[PDB]
Amino acid sequence: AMAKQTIIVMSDSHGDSLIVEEVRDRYVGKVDAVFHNGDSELRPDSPLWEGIRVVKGNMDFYAGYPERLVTELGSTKIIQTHGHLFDINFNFQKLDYWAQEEEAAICLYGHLHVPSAWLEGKILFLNPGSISQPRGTIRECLYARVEIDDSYFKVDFLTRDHEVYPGLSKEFSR
């Protein structure tokens, strides 16, 4: 039985560097990985990115962010993209095709500023929400925690004070 993993995922921070630093500082070295799914509006050479896996958003104009990132975490293959290059506002068919060709455990995306967690195929798709500019029905700034083991993905959405926001948590069996 694999040892349990915990990942921290955020996105669409939009020029708020204190929140990125705060989340880095809180979690780097205490969880298995920390992810940012883009639209930070920060420089890729920022020291705030030490310990964090970050991809390019459409509102990231500086050279040096990757469009896609594959992170293999033990037996867990995580893929990560902003989403704009997959036309996710149209639908998720292009994103899901890529996730299937990669045979990902987890597919991380941003762009929509809407928190979501669903299982399609055996693949968890997660948008952590926007940590600065929430959209849709939930007007609270959010990021996400995923707990991973052989039996379950557990997803909680967390506020900027690092508390679980109720009514959004999901548990998926694998």
Ligand SMILES: [Cl-]
């Ligand atoms: Cl799009």
Ligand SMILES: [Cl-]
């Ligand atoms: Cl946008």
Ligand SMILES: [Mn+2]
């Ligand atoms: Mn954005």
Ligand SMILES: [Mn+2]
């Ligand atoms: Mn975007």
